[PDB]
Amino acid sequence: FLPVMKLFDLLYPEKECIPVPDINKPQSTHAFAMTCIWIHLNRKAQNGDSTLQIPIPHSLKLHHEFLQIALLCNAYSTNSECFTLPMGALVETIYGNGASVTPLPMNLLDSLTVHAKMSLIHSIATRVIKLAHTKSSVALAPALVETYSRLLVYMEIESLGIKGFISQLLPTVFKSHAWGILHTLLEMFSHRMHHIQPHYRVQLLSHLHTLAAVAQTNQNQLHLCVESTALRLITALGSSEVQPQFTRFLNDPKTVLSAESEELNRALILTLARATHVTDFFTGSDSIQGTWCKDILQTIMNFTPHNWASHTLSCFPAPLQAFFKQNNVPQESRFNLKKNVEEEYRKWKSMTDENEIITQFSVQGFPPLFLCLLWKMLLETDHISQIGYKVLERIGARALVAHVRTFADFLVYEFSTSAGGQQLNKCIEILNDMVWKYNIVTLDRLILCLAMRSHEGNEAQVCYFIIQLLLLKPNDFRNRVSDFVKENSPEHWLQSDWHTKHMSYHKKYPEKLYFEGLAEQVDPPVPIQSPYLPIYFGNVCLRFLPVFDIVIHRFLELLPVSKSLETLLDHLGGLYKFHDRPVTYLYNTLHYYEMCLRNRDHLKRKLVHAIIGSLKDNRPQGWCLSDTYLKHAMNAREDNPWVPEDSYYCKLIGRLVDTMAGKSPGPFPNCDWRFNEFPNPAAHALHVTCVELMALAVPGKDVGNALLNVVLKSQPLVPRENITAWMNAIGLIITALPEPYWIVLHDRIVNVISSSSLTSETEWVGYPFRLFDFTACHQSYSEMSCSYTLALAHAVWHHSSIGQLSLIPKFLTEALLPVVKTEFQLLYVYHLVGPFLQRFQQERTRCMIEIGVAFYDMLLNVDQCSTHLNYMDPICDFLYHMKYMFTGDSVKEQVEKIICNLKPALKLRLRFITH
């Protein structure tokens, strides 16, 4: 540090006095930096007890004694002797106290925590772990731990630390019930912190799964919420993350992943399908690499969900569980219906005078035996008689999942057996109305249970109206979510009063769930169970995402469902203010629907105005040019946005090429580069690209042509000095578009560009190398359109080089065969496919052989149709390179069956290929 400090004082502090008093209440660290480094080197000298205690603080002598404003609390505590006065300057825990039951509101991030990193690392950590060691001796007063959750760089520096601390706390399950610490933070820790390392987050997911399974949970009755939380971590990030981490969960499925979280496992496999959709992990092989997922299927085969039974098997990459289709045994062979009905009748007649014994008889849950009792109660004018309340509080804590599954199944069966309207009206009047007050589910669990049996072959056509009436029922709770607008838009990152806000919220709307709405014989209120209740049930929004997905992405056959969905967000749009990733949420919805959605796409002409409505639920001031599209897409949408979008596209991609050195890093990014998915603004590009004109017949062909017009035609704004970055950005975009959009591109390229005339006599420009090589655009000539297109391909293949290459072999095997006669066309297709063999040698090993045999097929074709080869040695040493560097010694035999029937000259030329 000696030379560094010397050079810093020399260069930076170049003066002879002590200027710049620098009060600077907003920010003064930059000014006091020199004084602080001098204080630190003096502290080091004093610790060494030598070097004259580092004298001469002259330069900033005044600032040397500035210690004797809350924002001016620059804690230099890290060095020494600043843990009494400066440490107390920071808001500590509450020791005076033990519904505003928490004083000392939270501190702001930008104010002081932006700088105090080297000092505050584990200060509050030691306190909280010391409190956690023995027990929760008193009701935990410090709720300031929210600030502890509002620590991003701190986690970035001590991720391993908090993991180790949590693992060391884990023996709390042997100590006392594992409650008094975990339910304290695991929710808010996961809510307030959105961005985290992927390996770390999947390890946390695994640990949470184990903790849910082991140890025993039968004593933790409120663990239900813990399940819901676990949903987010597997649903909100499942795009390309699970596959690299395959090595880290090689043994976890072998021991425990299917204990009781069957709904979690279903959401997991749905997200896994969504992920593996990109990029074509099922096309190449059949069951070789399937070990990556087949083990997972093992879990699924423990309970065999997803049993359409050859009815609507179209929205999947490749149905592998379709082999295990007979293990479903739906509706228990259609016979156990009346049997369980008679069973529950007999059990009712018995429990009439056996309650004190049926308490101990009703063990093991007995799903299609007990919950049907509900069908009786409130059906006989509130004939509950509180006999079942104790039973539910004792046994139905966990097994309620299969219970409500059978309940959904039975209610759908009843709605179907109604058959005419004699009951439908009575249903809407009483049956779906009594479920409101006061079910423990609170419209949270029923969605996935309904989904598990709705998509089945039995009565998929009428559960539609069930979902319809279900979404139409909310008219007393949705108003709470409606007035809940004033929590996120005002403050979502700069929390200053959220504490009392959510306090008043959980005081106003909810009253109680553990007791009944009717006071039985004895009811001691004693309201004390409120240690930590920051969020009550707002988290459902996470699981609210599959609701649409399972009802839109899965059910799209009947069009009037549109009339449903447009209402939902119209009442719950504002609820979306926690995450925005529509790309992974919408891409799967059109993987193969386009070829048949066209007519229904007319109704999508409405749905887009709904989907963009979900985009409307965001007020960060982050859009200044998409608003042009918005304005030109509000009146007579079937007139304006067809053509000029091309230019608009340029404007759009302009921002892309404005990502590097321009002025776009101004008002575009804000608030706070932390949770708005901003590692790079490039991710903002793919936002609208697909949903732009998917309403009309624009997709299929016109979209690809529009995307490629930026190349073959000289756009006015397009400058000829940086087209490289332009094509790069075009490829970046293309990487996020559905199949046909970027497959029509290949057909357009090979259609006429590679074959304008090019066979009889193109021109004296037929020199292949100068033309087909890029960077010739550096001059205002030698920029023939075709060559441009070449780079175009390279462009996308400059970034789409993960799994998309599996497309080119087929794309070769047919298409490139009957289009090539001469040799420069061969050099062209070579340059097209050539410089990518490394990606096949690495991953797509099975396809490089096809690429090679395609090369040799082109060779045989140009040999059979040619007067004489003009550029023999180029192709010769080209093939030499390809052989000696990429094919090794595998294809040697097959090429033989072609290489023998070549021209004698070519035969002598390629003689040494035999070995």
């Binding site: 030379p3 010397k6 002879e16 070097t51 004259l52 004298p55 330069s59």
Partner: protein
């Protein structure tokens, strides 16, 4: 505060002896103002000083002064000038540097323009050969003699000035005590480093 001046001139007359004196008088003197010579920042810290060693007209018909040592952080350039001063100086043994000390006075002058906001200015000069010459400066406006130099160093400014010569004693100390302000040329002693020479 602590405005000192370090001067030596016996390089031409006697070089190795200085190296010996450095082992007993020069090096301990510097430690009075530093925790130990190592490599630290240098600025107007009051305790800075200069290092001035030149030769005589014997074999230098084109050079008299080349001093450069404003602050030097009291360690680096100090030790450098100590160990890398010079090895030259021939001719004969009649006078080596008197005109030098006059320039030394001039150095004090810049302190008046640099050390604004007293400082108990001190100075020390070493010369083995007994000096005497007619010229005064030949470098700047100021001019005088050895007598003028000493009366300036004493009366004009209360700069404590001593001369720690080799163990031998020439006919110099006598005239150098004719100043009414206490010259304090006492620090020529084998005893350890004086507090303030």
């Amino acid at each position: 505060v602590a405005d000192v001046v370090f001067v030596i001139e016996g390089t031409a007359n006697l070089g190795p002896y200085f190296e010996e004196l450095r082992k007993h008088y020069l090096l301990p003197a510097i430690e009075y103002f530093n925790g130990g010579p190592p490599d630290f920042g240098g600025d107007y810290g009051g305790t800075q000083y200069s290092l001035v060693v030149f030769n005589t007209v014997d074999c230098a018909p084109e050079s008299y002064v080349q001093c450069h040592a404003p602050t030097s952080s009291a360690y680096e350039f100090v030790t450098w000038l100590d160990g890398i001063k010079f090895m030259g100086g021939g001719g004969e043994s009649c006078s080596l540097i008197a005109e030098g000390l006059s320039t030394a006075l001039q150095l004090f002058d810049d302190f008046k323009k640099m050390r604004e906001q007293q400082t108990h200015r001190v100075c020390l000069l070493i010369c083995n050969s007994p000096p005497y010459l007619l010229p005064a400066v030949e470098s700047t406006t100021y001019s005088g003699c050895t007598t003028e130099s000493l009366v300036q160093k004493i009366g004009e400014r209360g700069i404590h000035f001593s001369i720690v010569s080799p163990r031998k004693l020439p006919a110099l100390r006598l005239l150098f005590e004719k100043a009414a302000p206490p010259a304090l040329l006492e620090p020529l002693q084998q005893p350890a480093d004086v507090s303030q020479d």
